[model samples]
Target chain A: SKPQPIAAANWKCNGSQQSLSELIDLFNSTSINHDVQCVVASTFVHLAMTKERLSHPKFVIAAQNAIAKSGAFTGEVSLPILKDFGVNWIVLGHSERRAYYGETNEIVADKVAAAVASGFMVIACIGETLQERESGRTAVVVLTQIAAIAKKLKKADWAKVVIAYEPVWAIGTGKVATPQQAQEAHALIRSWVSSKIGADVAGELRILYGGSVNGKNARTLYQQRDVNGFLVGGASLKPEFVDIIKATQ
Target chain B: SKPQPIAAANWKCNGSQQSLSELIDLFNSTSINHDVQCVVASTFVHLAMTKERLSHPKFVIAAQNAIAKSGAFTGEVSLPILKDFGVNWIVLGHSERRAYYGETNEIVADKVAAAVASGFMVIACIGETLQERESGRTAVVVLTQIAAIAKKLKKADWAKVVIAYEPVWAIGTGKVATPQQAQEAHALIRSWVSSKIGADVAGELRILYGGSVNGKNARTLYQQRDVNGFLVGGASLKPEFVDIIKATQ
Candidate 1:
């Protein structure tokens, strides 16, 4: 069977309370069916209201990121805070988080454990930087990233996680990965999970492609067997995002 | 002459939807006279409601943290979002943020510049950790922290900022600092600003003390010449938080 279809919109640092209201109204007006699952992972600034404004059985609201533990870590959002606010999913380990904020593999794993332990779905992202990819260490680098989360999560917990492959060189640069590049990366990620956790869980897991995934190229990319959906970045903030949401249909 | 008194509560990852409502009701019932200013910096989950529930001419609302810029920093809250949500202040450089998240002085300064550039007030927190305090380098450490902010701001920008001196050892550790200790730190902070800018701006600045502050000791600590008010912690989550707000009288 093919993996489930899911498109996660990572609002990143964009949007105001006004933009949030406008986006949610636009999203709710667009009818989404089970043909694909949709989640909008927005900043904590307006997340709860996003959840309040547009909640449906199949539609999910997610946090752009979170810390591993709860309480006393001032300025850091915890999983408990997300769960309490009715966040349906948490996006962890985005390339920007790793490169800009110094988020290590182990730190990402810890956040994954906490997110799953609290019973929330996770779209844990991983990818190779331009240097790592140019150096021909893409497989080795991506495997290490996946292995970190794999080691910390329980086998059953795999049910709650979806991994997005975003090439660092491609993110926000308007230079997206080629079709072959994304497919090979997704296949490589699936194999790593299959080898470590077994083919069954790996088969059940959904892998998505990200990095400049605008509405223009979404349908072709979503057509890949391993590429179940997308983890959209800049394009997620625009009205074009609605087109991206319905791209597959 | 005394700078105006202010009370800020850093919820620090504690509270729920129900608890936020309950706490707001508790706070709205309390009369915060012109004797002191009031602000509650709750988790991002409840910030909008905290604004909606208890907005008054005499009160302010703040965010525990904000990202440096307005784009693509996942899981970050930006100033536009804060302003749109009615947040009057953004807390930066808190010890917890520094220690746990690896936010160095440069990073904190960058955030300060962005926030002030957007016309938002900043509660730029600076403090010595337990190690620095025990080693008697509290002055050195706190001075360095303040100096970082001082270097980034224009002389006039100080009008949009407050300095909160929270000894890391005292925060959440039930180890409140002595009245003399807090005054000394506040005095040193004021002197740093005094030397960097001028006494006119420094004296006009309001420097608050934080870390394990509760109602029992708030009156004594608040009465000191330099200690203008508090950034309440644990007690802020309790019914006693209001008492801390009214500590002056």
Candidate 2:
């Protein structure tokens, strides 16, 4: 069997109580396929409220980020706290975090290892910047990012990890990689996993395509053989997010 | 009249659901002096639960940190989302944030100015490291930290800003500054405020002493004329937190 499709929405630093409630209502009213895993990542402040409002076996709440340990690290959300709010999935190493917050590949790997050891699923993101991509180091940059996390994980840990390939230049910039462009990256990643990690782990691992994902392009991106799902960004806030979810079918 | 005493609790990255409920119960049952302002800073995931459980005109919920703007910044808690969860007080520029996260003085000031502009009160922390203190540059380090934020505010903005002077070497290390030592820093801060930021604003602005603050030392520190309140660390999670609150009386 192929890896389960995951349609994950990262609301990022956006969404208020009112807007979140409206979006929740829209999502709750929409029907989701059982085969596809539906997840919504709320800003830390909204986790508990989102948990209270949204519920389904296939649906889950995710934290945009969480620290490994929970003490004296002011201004960081922790794994235990996310659990208290009924959050079981955490999005680690988003490009924005890497670019703006200085989450180095090593830092991202440690967080992934910690979260997995603590029994939570992780959407570990890896991507290259525009400069790196244009410089012909996309493969080098992304593989190194994955290698850091891969070295820390056991075979079982891969089952709990979903890889999201988000090109930094494409994210939130209204510029998306064409279907062929995205598939090339996804295929390269899966091929690397098969050779480096293991063939069995590669087949079971879900690789989600992220970066300027919207209703219009969701279907085409989902059609890629190696593209298991998506990590929706800006368009996730709109009613059309349901359309993106439906595209997984 | 002297500035109101604020017994602000920064849980930092600690506390579980069960522990937080117990702490909330201990806090809600305690009789706080009407004159003191009590604020509890929860891990962002616990903000809604904390706001729902703890209620008093003198008591409020605070986020340990908040970004100045909201949108596209993954893994960040924003001012608007914090407001949604009934958080009005924000703690900016804590020593830990400076040490671990790359929140520079200018970044913290930008956030403080933005939060103040958006009608939220702020506890802007500034402090010197052990080396700086040992080298006799405590005043220089702290003043520079303060000056960065001061330039971002007007006379009125001072009313909404509470300055927390935490010695980095003392924080979570159980080596609190002696009352006289703490008084010297507070007095120096007040003098700087009078000369540079204005005496009227200085008198109205509250200066909180943080780092290794506990029930035992709360009274001695509170007796200092320039030390208006405290930003309690570990003790804030204990039953003795009440004792620290009572010290303000």
Candidate 3:
């Protein structure tokens, strides 16, 4: 049997109630592949409405970010609150969080561990910056980021985690990695996981290519053996998202 | 005529849907003073549900925090989203945000300016840490925090800003500032506004006392000349929040 591929859309601090309702209507009108697991990460304010409106079995609601602990952190959405709202999928450690919000690798790892332990499925994001890529240290930077998370999790916890490789240079920049570049990064991640953790878990894990992924490029990226699916950014808010999800079929 | 007092509740990374519904029921049953302008600053996840369930004339919903700008900053709830959801009030620069998150004074000021300019009322928080208090730099630290925000706004903009003086040592520690201590801080803030901004604006502005405010001490603190109301924390989640609101009467 083939493994389930994921097409996760990160709305990324975008969308209003009106815009979201329109997106939900658009998503509902289209047919999604049963084998492809589609996830939409809405801003915390819209999660409940998104969950209520989008009831497709293959579609899941995800929080773009959440805190590890529960109390006293003012202005933070906690894991328990997410659980209470029926939001089980969380996207942690996005480049935006790391750059603007001071989320370091260790901080992201702690959040990942806490979320996974709380019975939530996590899309743990990891990637290198353009500076690191230009300096020919993409593998070193990405692996180190993943290694930080790997240190915090048990071998079995890997089953609950989906790693999204979003190169910072490519994210929201209208520049995406070529099919070969995407495969190389995904393959590098899988090989590293195999070496560090175990071959069995590595083979079973899903690695999604993120950063400027659109409907037109979706199938070509999906064709890569190691590129399980995509973590769509700006394109996720449009009608093309349906095509991207269908491309996973 | 006396100026209208504000009793704002900062839920602060707390409350489930079940718990919030019960809180609303308790608040609805209570006879709140007509003069008091009560605000409930809920976590982003619960804001819309809270707005829907708790609709009273004086009572309003507020976002615990929001970004200075909109679009592309993943995980941050922006001002426009808050507006679209009918949230006109925002709590900016809580001590927790300044400490746990790296929200420097300037960053918080930027948010305050942005929120006010966008026609949203802001409960701008300012406070001195324990170390600063122990060193007798409390006045210096807090005044600087307020000064940063003041520099970014016009004299009229102060009308949309409510200053919350939350002494860091007293927050969540079960230790509250005495009436004299709170009054002195509030007076110092008002005096700064008078000398710097103007006496008319200072007299018209509402300065709220925060940090370990509960039902028992609410009246005593509210009785202070400069201490107009409270930015209640933990007690806001409980039934005692009603008493705190009534204390203003």
Best by lDDT: 3
Better of 2 and 3 by DockQ: 3
Q: Could you give the candidate ranking by lDDT, starting with the highest?
A: 3, 2, 1
Sliding window of 10 residues with minimal summed lDDT for model 3 chain A: A25-34
Rank the models by DockQ, top first.
3, 2, 1
lDDT of 1 by residue, A1-249 (tens): 676688788988888767778888877778766578888888787776786797555568888888866788888778776777777688998888888787899989998888899988999989887778778899899999999988888789999999999878665565657788889999999988898898999898989887667777888787777878888888888888877877755
Q: Return the lDDT, model 3, position A70.
A: 74
lDDT of 2 by residue, A44-113 (tens): 8888778889856667889899898889999887887777666789999998898888899999999999
| Global lDDT scores for all candidate models | 0.83, 0.88, 0.90
- The CAPRI class of candidate 2 is high
Clashing pairs in 3: none
Model 1, residue A247: distance off in Å is 3.5
Better of 1 and 3 by DockQ: 3
Supply DockQ values for each candidate: 0.78, 0.85, 0.88
Record all residue pairs in model 2 with backbone atoms less than 3 Å apart, i.e. clashing.
none
lDDT string for model 3 (B1-249, tens) is 336899998999988999899999888777865689999999999987898899677798898899966688889989988889889999999999999899899999999999999999899999987789889899899889999999999999998989999988765555657899999999999999999999889898999997778899998888889988899888999999988998898
Q: Which ranges of candidate 2 are over 4 A from the true structure?
A: A172-176
